Every structure is written in C-alpha cells, then in structure tokens.
Amino acid sequence: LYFQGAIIKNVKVPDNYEIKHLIGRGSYGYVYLAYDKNANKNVAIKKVNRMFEDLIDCKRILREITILNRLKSDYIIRLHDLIIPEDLLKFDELYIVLEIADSDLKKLFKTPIFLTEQHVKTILYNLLLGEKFIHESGIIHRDLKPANCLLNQDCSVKICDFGLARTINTSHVVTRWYRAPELILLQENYTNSIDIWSTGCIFAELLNMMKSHINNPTNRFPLFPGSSCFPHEKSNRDQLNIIFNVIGTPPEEDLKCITKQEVIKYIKLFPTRDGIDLSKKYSSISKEGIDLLESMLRFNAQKRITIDKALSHPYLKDVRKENLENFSTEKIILPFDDWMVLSETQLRYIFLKEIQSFHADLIIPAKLN
Numbered sequence: 001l002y003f004q005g006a007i008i009k010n011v012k013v014p015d016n017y018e019i020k021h022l023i024g025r026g027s028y029g030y031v032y033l034a035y036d037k038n039a040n041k042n043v044a045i046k047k048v049n050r051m052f053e054d055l056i057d058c059k060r061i062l063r064e065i066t067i068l069n070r071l072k073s074d075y076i077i078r079l080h081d082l083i084i085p086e087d088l089l090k091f092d093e094l095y096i097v098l099e100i101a102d103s104d105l106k107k108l109f110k111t112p113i114f115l116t117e118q119h120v121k122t123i124l125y126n127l128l129l130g131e132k133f134i135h136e137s138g139i140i141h142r143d144l145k146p147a148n149c150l151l152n153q154d155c156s157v158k159i160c161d162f163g164l165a166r167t168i169n170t171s172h173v174v175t176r177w178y179r180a181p182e183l184i185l186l187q188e189n190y191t192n193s194i195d196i197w198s199t200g201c202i203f204a205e206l207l208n209m210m211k212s213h214i215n216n217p218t219n220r221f222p223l224f225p226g227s228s229c230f231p232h233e234k235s236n237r238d239q240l241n242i243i244f245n246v247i248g249t250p251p252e253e254d255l256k257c258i259t260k261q262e263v264i265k266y267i268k269l270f271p272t273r274d275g276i277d278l279s280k281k282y283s284s285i286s287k288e289g290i291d292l293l294e295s296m297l298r299f300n301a302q303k304r305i306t307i308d309k310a311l312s313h314p315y316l317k318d319v320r321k322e323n324l325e326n327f328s329t330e331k332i333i334l335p336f337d338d339w340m341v342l343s344e345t346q347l348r349y350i351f352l353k354e355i356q357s358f359h360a361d362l363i364i365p366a367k368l369n
C-alpha cells in the first residue's frame, strides 16, 4: 500500500528549497516544482541520475549547464542555482535549479483547449526571438522540440535543454521528429537553419490547436512522426520517408549542397513523390502563413528562411515587436569544446567550477585538477 506522493522522496536538497511536486520528465531528468525561501519565488529543480556511467551523457549535462549559465535572456530559461553535491569526488547525481515556467508546448498540445491564431502567432514569434539570441551568441540548439519550449500563461516562451547544442565556429528514448534532414543525414556542417526546421515542425503543432483545423483535441499529431523513439539506418529511413511524404522528394538544386556520393544515391533511391498541399491541411490560415510554414520546412538548408526573415515575415506583422529584435550580446565561450574527449576527472572539474560559480566558497579537490 505505497503512497504515490512518495515521488518527492528521492529529492534531497538544501533546506531553503521546499519540494512541492513532480512537474515533468524527459529522457534524462525528472523536474520538480519547489519554493525557494531565500529568493521568495517558485523554481524548477531538474534531477539527473547515473551521470558518469556514460561519458557522452555526462558531457551532455555539462553542456546544458555551461550554456544556460552563460546565457542572459528573458527568452532562455534562467539557471537559478546548482546544488552542491555531498560527495565532491564521487557524486553521480546533480540537482539543476531553474527559473520556473507554467508549462511547455508538449503539454499544451495535449490539453483540451483551443488557441486563436493570434495565440499561435504570439507564441511562434516569442520562440523565434529566443532562437535569434541563440544565434547571436554563436550557438545552435540542435534539438528544439515541444518539450523544451517552456510556456507561461502570458504566451512567453522560454527555451531550455541545451545539452545537444553545438557552437558556431546507455540507451534512452530519442525523439527524431523535429530533426532537419541534413542532421538526419549526418552531414559534416550545418547552420542555425537546423533550429528553423525544428521551428517549422513546432509551428505545424501550434497550427493544430486551432479548432478550425482540428475540431477534436484528441487528434492533434506531429507533422513528421516517422521514426520510432525507443531503442541508425532504419529509424532514419522512416523519418526521411515521412518528411518526403509531406514536402516532397527534393529537386536537383537541393542536392548540390551534399558532399558524399553514397548519400545522394541513398536519397535518389527514395521514389520520386510530391508533397502534400499544406494549404489544404491548414486551410484557415493565409497564404502568407503557409509561406512561412513552407519556408521553414525547405529540404535545402540554404534556401530555408532565416531567423531574421522569419521575425520580419508578413504573417507575423500583426504581433511583431521590432524593438525586441534589436539587442546586443556576445558570443559565449564554453569551458570545453565539441571535439574534446574528456575524462571523468576532467568532467568533474568543470562541473565543480560551474557549481562554484553559484557557490563562491566551494573548494575543488586536488585530485581533480
């Protein structure tokens, strides 16, 4: 006769944080509502377990933490605190304290509520302002999806979950539904256009919330749900399949970017087909709206609409705030680099320095230098 309210049990955090309840979960973390006595505010606390088993996963959480700690924007979720581990040399857990948000787009999409088109617009624009800041800081998030676009009741969007981000120069559930084809196809280089693609996918799901497109909330679906999310060739073949089913086999101009012969030949062996007509799928929105949607979802990363053009797109004139597009921020420097293979030792050092940024007096063990 166990109590389900024993989900709070595993969460051990300094006494100034009062754990209230569970709010959300992903493939890596469970996150909890908590009240902070010292700051007088609600916060979110992400707990990540088993964090040195796999070192690729370890690096992931370091990247998430180091990025958010060096970002300063109302459109990116704030890093409120990092809790000192009790065992500084052998800790396998980490408590990440974040600015709280009311919700997230994945939750909204499941709720039995309908949005107006102004809502859709307000939200997409807010998302794009966030992506702009990510760009101007010389980062590509690389894994934008409904789960990591947090939402507040006033329609403001806060981006999170930067563990897959890259800089501009075990087994888990893995969602490939918002991945750009170039990424699916594993091409050498890529730009922020990768985040615009993801934005297009999200936009389709924002469009689903209008009653005139979908009368019954039960039946809102992602645009590209091809890949299976549970544990390279087959998963990506299905994800590439469904993308072509929607936007079409690509034309020759789109294939000129590609470097490797075998990839072109892989592509070319998907039977030629035309897209769906998205105007017919989303037939309550203007031709401008559909233009914005179709521009974000171009196979050609080069022809895909840019952040700046999406912000200034006529479909969003009604909500645009050119005042907020113009800000000044520098390219952040991360305390490690993408290529760097790093030891447990070295990764524990960098964690503790970040934790030290929030806790001035923390002393890093000599063993970890």
Ligand SMILES: Nc1ncnc2c1ncn2[C@@H]1O[C@H](COP(=O)(O)OP(=O)(O)NP(=O)(O)O)[C@@H](O)[C@H]1O
Pocket (backbone or CB within 6 Å): 023, 024, 025, 026, 027, 028, 029, 030, 031, 044, 046, 077, 098, 099, 100, 101, 102, 103, 104, 106, 107, 146, 147, 148, 150, 160, 161
């Ligand atoms: N600051 C926050 N405020 C409120 N809810 C949050 C916050 N951060 C995360 N959540 C909720 O927790 C979920 C998981 O967060 P996320 O950062 O994706 O965890 P993760 O497992 O570490 N990353 P992923 O596996 O890519 O989802 C989100 O989809 C939200 O429902």
